[PDB]
Design a protein around this nucleic acid. Sequence first.
DNA 1: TCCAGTCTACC
DNA 2: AGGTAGACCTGGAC
Length: 259
Amino acid sequence: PELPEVETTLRGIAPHIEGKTVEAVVLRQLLRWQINPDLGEILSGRQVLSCGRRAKYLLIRFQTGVLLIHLGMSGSLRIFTPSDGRIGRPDRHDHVDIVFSDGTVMRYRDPRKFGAILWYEGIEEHHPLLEKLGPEPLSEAFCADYLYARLKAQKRAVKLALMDNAVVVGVGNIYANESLFRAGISPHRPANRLKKKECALLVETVKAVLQRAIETGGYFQQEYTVYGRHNQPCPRCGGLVVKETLGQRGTFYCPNCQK
DNA sequence: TCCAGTCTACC
DNA sequence: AGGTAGACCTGGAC
Ligand SMILES: [Zn+2]
């Protein structure tokens, strides 16, 4: 999932687990990194006081420590209310249940197991995976002035820089492809060759694209302008969308509307 | 057959 | 260092 889906996941679990208290934790497997056995002993009786998100990580907080959950490329987190009989029917990819004092179940699912469930004891801001991340794309800190300045010593394709978590978090393959198209910029443009006006447009397109996706999250449908539309018509010029490989990632764009 | 986040590793 | 590729693993689309 990318940042819209993680933010929508966050907004879905929080009203369902925050005030509540953990009673058991089921571990049908133990991902990219190993899970901690006796996580149930760790969390039993501990109230949730907050959930949160940083980059594509979810954060479940207690007074004793922080649970970090990453969905990777195919992970899901879902709530089952006590009356929901799907509690009794987990599939082979439903690796973890987090069961609350009231019967509510939070279920983590992840077929390829690229996600992570990690338990951490110290200061949130110092976690090794969160410490060196760049700014939030929907924060004031991700501005045209920062971006133009961060990009001056980078010769690399701007798509690489825009997908770099040290430059800005959360802009994955889909929304980097869509923002670069909507801003009119080739993904192959050297990052330091974006003009200041172009970095201001790319910034506001990222913010707009990501925000609309957070709210959105037989008949003709088309979510995307270029992503996953190899060899189909560009919605602006009608020309064919090309797909290339840039930084090991599928890169879709129109060479006519993007320079 | 090949397509679909990020930590590690080498020149 | 910056730039590259490999590593993880499983399901579904031509
Ligand atoms: Zn076009």
